[PDB]
Amino acid sequence: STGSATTTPIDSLDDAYITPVQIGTPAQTLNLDFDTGSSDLWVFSSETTASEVDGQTIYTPSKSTTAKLLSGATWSISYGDGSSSSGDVYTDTVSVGGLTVTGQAVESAKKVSSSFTEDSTIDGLLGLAFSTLNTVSPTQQKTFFDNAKASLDSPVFTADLGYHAPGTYNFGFIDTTAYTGSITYTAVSTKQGFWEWTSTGYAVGSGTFKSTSIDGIADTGTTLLYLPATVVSAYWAQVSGAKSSSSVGGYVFPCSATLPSFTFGVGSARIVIPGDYIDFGPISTGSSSCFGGIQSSAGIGINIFGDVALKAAFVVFNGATTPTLGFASK
């Protein structure tokens, strides 16, 4: 089997991407944030504290003839941005782009933190990291991908995120028309439960490539590119007037600037992030200070190849017995 679904930016800045997901019988379609940095499929629901729901579409398990309470199971998750959610668990039928999994754990939120409430466009998350990070207790549950894997034509999914435009998540096949040149594959460590890999270096604009190993994670659920302070300083030094602002919470730059590109290495291959992908617009409405899309990972504890990086590539998440990651230009 295969599946193919379009993923759509939630706003004009590509702060996140939503993908429609069918849950239950008859189908209830929710727009979920596909997140290769976590492993829980959780939804706003009829059980979510009413004051914490503000415009989201909810899953109502009592209206699904295939929903079953997973007795005694609870979940609770905290994300790198400080947001969180928790609740109980149902199993139900879940379909993505024509690919159907029966008996998928659908984690129903009883509580969500303010940032989720405040984002009306995201009805929940669909985790695509390794199932070892799933938070369901006392019986850990599998991701949608893990459940689908054996039925797939090939045990892979691909992320093709757009810049200010829709893109695609495919399951079970590689669309050879969706990228240019060849796909370069690179080793993955699953030791921390992430799609963790080592970039071979970077360049700023038309500058020379610096060969240096940068361990980090391919994370579709993080907006920006978080890299070591040395790398980030070298990037922003090429933008007149750019500075790190403790009050704003990162590097800012004059909105009048033209940003240089940023290249990262995948083996001997190179992925070029155009300068415009690095512009996240005014820090506040009407400001001439703009927020940068490359930020320091210092104090996160891990480097994160988030959407800024991933949307410059066609990315293969290869879930073979030994997982790997592939990157192509597009």
Short mmCIF file of C-alpha atoms in Angstrom, two decimals:
data_model
loop_
_atom_site.label_atom_id
_atom_site.label_comp_id
_atom_site.label_asym_id
_atom_site.label_seq_id
_atom_site.Cartn_x
_atom_site.Cartn_y
_atom_site.Cartn_z
CA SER A 1 0.00 0.00 0.00
CA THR A 2 0.88 3.67 -0.23
CA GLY A 3 -0.50 7.02 0.89
CA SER A 4 -0.05 10.58 -0.37
CA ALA A 5 -1.34 13.72 1.35
CA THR A 6 -0.83 17.41 0.79
CA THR A 7 0.64 19.43 3.65
CA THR A 8 -0.16 23.16 3.87
CA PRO A 9 1.52 26.02 5.77
CA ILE A 10 -0.64 27.35 8.63
CA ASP A 11 0.31 30.97 7.94
CA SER A 12 2.33 33.28 5.70
CA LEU A 13 5.57 32.51 7.55
CA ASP A 14 5.44 28.69 7.29
CA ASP A 15 5.37 28.49 11.09
CA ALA A 16 4.09 24.92 10.79
CA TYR A 17 2.34 22.66 8.28
CA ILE A 18 -0.99 20.85 8.58
CA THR A 19 -2.05 17.65 6.85
CA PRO A 20 -5.62 16.31 6.80
CA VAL A 21 -6.11 12.99 8.61
CA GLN A 22 -9.24 10.83 8.68
CA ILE A 23 -10.05 9.37 12.11
CA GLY A 24 -12.90 7.03 12.94
CA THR A 25 -16.04 5.74 11.24
CA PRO A 26 -17.61 7.71 9.67
CA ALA A 27 -14.45 9.68 9.07
CA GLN A 28 -13.72 12.74 11.17
CA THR A 29 -11.12 14.84 9.35
CA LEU A 30 -8.66 16.72 11.54
CA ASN A 31 -5.71 18.82 10.40
CA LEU A 32 -2.63 17.50 12.17
CA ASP A 33 0.96 18.72 12.48
CA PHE A 34 3.15 15.84 11.24
CA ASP A 35 6.12 15.82 13.58
CA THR A 36 9.24 13.73 12.91
CA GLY A 37 10.53 14.90 16.30
CA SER A 38 7.89 13.18 18.46
CA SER A 39 5.97 9.93 18.58
CA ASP A 40 2.44 10.60 19.83
CA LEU A 41 -0.68 11.00 17.66
CA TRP A 42 -2.86 13.26 19.80
CA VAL A 43 -5.96 15.29 19.01
CA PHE A 44 -8.22 17.96 20.34
CA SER A 45 -11.37 16.10 21.32
CA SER A 46 -14.78 16.13 22.94
CA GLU A 47 -12.86 15.46 26.18
CA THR A 48 -10.67 18.58 25.94
CA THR A 49 -11.33 21.13 28.71
CA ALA A 50 -13.79 23.52 27.05
CA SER A 51 -11.92 26.72 27.91
CA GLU A 52 -8.81 25.29 26.19
CA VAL A 53 -10.56 24.80 22.84
CA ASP A 54 -10.66 27.88 20.55
CA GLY A 55 -11.58 27.09 16.96
CA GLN A 56 -9.98 23.67 16.56
CA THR A 57 -11.83 20.76 15.03
CA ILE A 58 -12.34 18.03 17.63
CA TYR A 59 -12.42 14.25 17.51
CA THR A 60 -15.51 12.83 19.20
CA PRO A 61 -14.88 9.14 19.85
CA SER A 62 -18.51 8.47 20.89
CA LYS A 63 -19.51 9.23 17.28
CA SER A 64 -17.07 6.68 15.83
CA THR A 65 -18.31 3.10 15.57
CA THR A 66 -14.72 1.84 15.42
CA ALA A 67 -13.41 3.77 18.47
CA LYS A 68 -12.51 1.74 21.56
CA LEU A 69 -11.23 3.11 24.86
CA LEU A 70 -7.77 1.75 25.57
CA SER A 71 -8.54 0.92 29.17
CA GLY A 72 -6.26 2.47 31.76
CA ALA A 73 -4.00 4.21 29.24
CA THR A 74 -2.94 7.81 29.73
CA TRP A 75 -0.45 10.09 28.02
CA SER A 76 1.39 13.31 28.81
CA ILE A 77 3.92 15.11 26.65
CA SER A 78 6.08 18.21 26.86
CA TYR A 79 7.72 19.68 23.77
CA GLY A 80 10.95 21.63 23.29
CA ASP A 81 9.08 24.92 23.01
CA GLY A 82 7.59 24.46 26.49
CA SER A 83 4.13 23.48 25.28
CA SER A 84 2.35 20.38 26.59
CA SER A 85 -0.78 18.23 26.48
CA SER A 86 -2.19 15.13 28.19
CA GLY A 87 -5.21 12.85 28.29
CA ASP A 88 -6.47 9.32 27.69
CA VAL A 89 -6.35 6.96 24.70
CA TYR A 90 -8.62 5.32 22.15
CA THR A 91 -7.81 2.95 19.32
CA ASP A 92 -9.48 3.77 16.02
CA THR A 93 -9.07 3.66 12.26
CA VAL A 94 -6.74 6.37 10.95
CA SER A 95 -6.14 7.16 7.28
CA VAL A 96 -3.61 9.50 5.69
CA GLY A 97 -3.80 10.20 1.99
CA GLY A 98 -5.52 6.88 1.26
CA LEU A 99 -3.34 4.76 3.56
CA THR A 100 -5.34 3.16 6.38
CA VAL A 101 -4.22 1.80 9.75
CA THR A 102 -6.71 -0.02 11.95
CA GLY A 103 -6.19 -0.06 15.71
CA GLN A 104 -4.09 3.11 15.78
CA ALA A 105 -3.65 4.71 19.20
CA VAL A 106 -5.42 8.08 19.06
CA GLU A 107 -4.50 10.07 22.14
CA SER A 108 -7.40 12.25 23.20
CA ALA A 109 -6.45 15.50 24.92
CA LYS A 110 -8.06 16.35 28.22
CA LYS A 111 -5.67 19.29 28.71
CA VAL A 112 -3.55 21.36 26.33
CA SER A 113 -1.26 24.30 27.07
CA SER A 114 -1.99 27.83 25.96
CA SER A 115 0.08 27.76 22.78
CA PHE A 116 -2.07 24.93 21.42
CA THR A 117 -5.31 26.64 22.40
CA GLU A 118 -4.11 29.83 20.75
CA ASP A 119 -3.39 28.12 17.43
CA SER A 120 -6.78 27.49 15.86
CA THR A 121 -5.27 25.87 12.76
CA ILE A 122 -3.67 22.82 14.43
CA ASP A 123 -6.09 20.10 15.59
CA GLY A 124 -3.33 17.88 17.01
CA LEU A 125 -0.01 16.21 16.21
CA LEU A 126 0.94 13.05 14.33
CA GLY A 127 4.32 11.84 15.54
CA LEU A 128 6.74 10.24 13.11
CA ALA A 129 9.86 9.77 15.29
CA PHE A 130 10.62 6.30 16.70
CA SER A 131 7.98 4.60 18.83
CA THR A 132 10.40 4.38 21.77
CA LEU A 133 9.51 8.05 22.50
CA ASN A 134 5.75 7.42 22.67
CA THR A 135 4.40 8.62 26.02
CA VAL A 136 1.41 6.29 26.52
CA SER A 137 1.48 4.55 29.88
CA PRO A 138 1.45 1.80 31.04
CA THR A 139 1.61 0.25 27.56
CA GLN A 140 3.64 2.27 25.06
CA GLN A 141 1.97 2.64 21.65
CA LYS A 142 3.26 2.62 18.08
CA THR A 143 3.31 5.53 15.64
CA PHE A 144 1.15 5.60 12.53
CA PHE A 145 4.24 4.86 10.43
CA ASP A 146 5.33 1.96 12.61
CA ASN A 147 1.82 0.45 12.35
CA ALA A 148 1.65 0.95 8.57
CA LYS A 149 5.19 -0.15 7.80
CA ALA A 150 4.71 -3.83 7.07
CA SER A 151 1.86 -3.09 4.65
CA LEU A 152 3.76 -0.40 2.74
CA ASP A 153 5.27 -1.11 -0.68
CA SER A 154 8.58 0.16 0.79
CA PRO A 155 9.15 0.96 4.48
CA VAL A 156 9.63 4.71 3.95
CA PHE A 157 7.92 8.04 4.12
CA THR A 158 9.00 11.28 2.50
CA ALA A 159 8.63 14.95 3.43
CA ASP A 160 8.46 17.53 0.66
CA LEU A 161 7.66 20.78 2.43
CA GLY A 162 6.98 23.91 0.43
CA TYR A 163 8.28 27.43 0.84
CA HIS A 164 5.20 29.61 1.24
CA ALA A 165 3.31 26.87 -0.63
CA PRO A 166 1.79 23.44 -0.12
CA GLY A 167 3.90 20.29 -0.23
CA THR A 168 3.50 16.55 0.21
CA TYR A 169 3.92 13.68 2.66
CA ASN A 170 4.13 10.29 0.90
CA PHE A 171 4.09 6.89 2.58
CA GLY A 172 5.46 3.72 1.05
CA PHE A 173 7.09 5.06 -2.12
CA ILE A 174 9.61 7.57 -3.43
CA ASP A 175 8.21 9.95 -6.07
CA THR A 176 11.12 10.20 -8.49
CA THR A 177 9.52 13.24 -10.18
CA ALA A 178 9.60 15.28 -6.96
CA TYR A 179 13.34 16.01 -6.79
CA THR A 180 16.30 16.85 -9.01
CA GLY A 181 19.54 14.92 -9.26
CA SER A 182 20.09 11.99 -6.89
CA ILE A 183 19.11 11.29 -3.29
CA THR A 184 22.10 11.12 -0.94
CA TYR A 185 21.57 8.76 1.97
CA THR A 186 23.22 9.18 5.35
CA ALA A 187 23.37 7.14 8.56
CA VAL A 188 20.83 7.53 11.38
CA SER A 189 21.21 6.92 15.09
CA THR A 190 17.97 5.95 16.82
CA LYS A 191 19.57 6.01 20.31
CA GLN A 192 17.61 9.11 21.40
CA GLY A 193 14.46 8.10 19.49
CA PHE A 194 14.94 10.74 16.77
CA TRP A 195 15.93 10.78 13.11
CA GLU A 196 19.42 11.80 14.21
CA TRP A 197 22.18 12.17 11.63
CA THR A 198 25.48 14.02 11.07
CA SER A 199 25.79 16.80 8.54
CA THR A 200 29.23 17.10 6.94
CA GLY A 201 29.45 20.89 7.17
CA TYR A 202 28.15 24.23 5.96
CA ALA A 203 28.69 27.34 3.84
CA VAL A 204 27.34 30.87 4.16
CA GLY A 205 26.26 32.50 0.92
CA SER A 206 28.91 32.12 -1.77
CA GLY A 207 31.56 31.38 0.85
CA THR A 208 33.79 28.34 1.03
CA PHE A 209 32.43 25.13 2.51
CA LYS A 210 33.56 24.34 6.05
CA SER A 211 33.94 20.60 6.60
CA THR A 212 32.77 19.87 10.13
CA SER A 213 30.50 17.25 11.67
CA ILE A 214 27.18 18.57 12.95
CA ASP A 215 25.02 16.00 14.73
CA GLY A 216 21.33 16.89 14.71
CA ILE A 217 17.76 15.74 14.11
CA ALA A 218 15.48 15.99 11.10
CA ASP A 219 12.43 17.52 12.73
CA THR A 220 9.41 18.55 10.69
CA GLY A 221 7.69 19.78 13.86
CA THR A 222 10.26 22.51 14.55
CA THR A 223 9.98 25.70 12.50
CA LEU A 224 13.57 26.94 12.46
CA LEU A 225 17.13 25.69 11.94
CA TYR A 226 19.00 25.42 15.26
CA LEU A 227 22.77 24.98 14.97
CA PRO A 228 25.90 25.48 17.10
CA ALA A 229 26.63 29.06 18.18
CA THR A 230 29.82 29.17 16.12
CA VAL A 231 27.93 28.32 12.91
CA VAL A 232 25.08 30.71 13.62
CA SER A 233 27.46 33.58 14.43
CA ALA A 234 29.29 32.99 11.14
CA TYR A 235 25.97 33.20 9.26
CA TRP A 236 24.64 36.39 10.89
CA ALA A 237 28.01 38.14 10.66
CA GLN A 238 27.30 38.35 6.92
CA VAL A 239 24.13 40.39 7.48
CA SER A 240 24.70 44.10 8.22
CA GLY A 241 23.04 45.08 11.47
CA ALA A 242 22.14 41.57 12.58
CA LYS A 243 22.52 40.87 16.28
CA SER A 244 21.49 38.44 18.96
CA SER A 245 18.80 39.96 21.14
CA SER A 246 18.24 38.45 24.58
CA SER A 247 14.99 40.44 24.89
CA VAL A 248 13.57 39.05 21.65
CA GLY A 249 15.05 35.57 22.17
CA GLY A 250 17.46 35.17 19.27
CA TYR A 251 19.05 36.71 16.24
CA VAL A 252 17.22 39.58 14.62
CA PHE A 253 18.14 41.55 11.53
CA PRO A 254 17.05 44.71 9.70
CA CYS A 255 14.01 43.94 7.60
CA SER A 256 15.68 45.93 4.79
CA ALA A 257 18.45 43.31 4.48
CA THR A 258 18.93 40.79 1.71
CA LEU A 259 19.80 37.49 3.43
CA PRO A 260 22.54 35.16 2.15
CA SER A 261 21.83 31.51 1.49
CA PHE A 262 22.96 28.77 3.86
CA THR A 263 24.30 25.44 2.61
CA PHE A 264 24.49 22.24 4.65
CA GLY A 265 26.30 19.03 3.77
CA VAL A 266 24.80 15.58 3.40
CA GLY A 267 27.79 13.35 2.76
CA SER A 268 29.50 14.79 -0.32
CA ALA A 269 26.21 16.43 -1.40
CA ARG A 270 25.02 19.96 -0.61
CA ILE A 271 21.55 21.36 0.17
CA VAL A 272 21.16 25.11 -0.38
CA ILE A 273 18.65 27.04 1.73
CA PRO A 274 17.84 30.30 -0.11
CA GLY A 275 18.17 33.49 1.93
CA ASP A 276 14.46 34.23 1.74
CA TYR A 277 13.71 30.97 3.63
CA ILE A 278 15.59 32.46 6.60
CA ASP A 279 13.30 35.53 6.93
CA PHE A 280 10.60 35.15 9.61
CA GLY A 281 9.37 38.69 9.37
CA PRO A 282 8.85 41.53 11.84
CA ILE A 283 9.35 40.64 15.50
CA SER A 284 6.06 42.44 16.19
CA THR A 285 3.52 43.98 13.83
CA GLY A 286 4.98 47.06 12.12
CA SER A 287 8.53 46.58 13.40
CA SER A 288 11.53 46.97 11.10
CA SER A 289 13.42 44.34 13.10
CA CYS A 290 12.94 40.88 11.58
CA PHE A 291 13.37 37.49 13.22
CA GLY A 292 15.99 35.11 11.86
CA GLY A 293 15.32 31.57 10.73
CA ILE A 294 18.73 30.26 11.80
CA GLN A 295 19.21 30.32 15.58
CA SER A 296 21.60 28.92 18.15
CA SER A 297 21.01 25.47 19.61
CA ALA A 298 23.11 26.33 22.67
CA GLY A 299 21.10 25.33 25.69
CA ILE A 300 18.66 23.19 23.67
CA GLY A 301 21.14 20.35 23.94
CA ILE A 302 20.67 19.17 20.36
CA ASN A 303 20.93 20.65 16.87
CA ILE A 304 17.65 20.70 14.98
CA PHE A 305 17.22 20.60 11.23
CA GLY A 306 13.71 22.03 11.31
CA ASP A 307 11.43 23.21 8.53
CA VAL A 308 13.79 25.99 7.37
CA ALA A 309 16.30 23.30 6.38
CA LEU A 310 13.96 20.48 5.41
CA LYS A 311 11.80 22.56 3.06
CA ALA A 312 14.91 23.15 0.89
CA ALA A 313 15.05 19.39 0.22
CA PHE A 314 13.13 16.27 -0.68
CA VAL A 315 13.69 14.16 2.43
CA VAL A 316 13.42 10.36 2.70
CA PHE A 317 12.78 8.85 6.12
CA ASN A 318 13.87 5.28 5.48
CA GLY A 319 12.44 2.94 8.12
CA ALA A 320 14.21 -0.20 6.98
CA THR A 321 15.69 -2.49 9.62
CA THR A 322 18.66 -0.12 9.72
CA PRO A 323 17.05 3.30 9.28
CA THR A 324 18.68 5.99 7.13
CA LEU A 325 17.84 9.50 5.89
CA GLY A 326 17.99 10.66 2.30
CA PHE A 327 18.22 14.22 0.99
CA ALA A 328 17.83 15.52 -2.57
CA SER A 329 17.65 19.02 -4.02
CA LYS A 330 14.36 19.93 -5.68
#
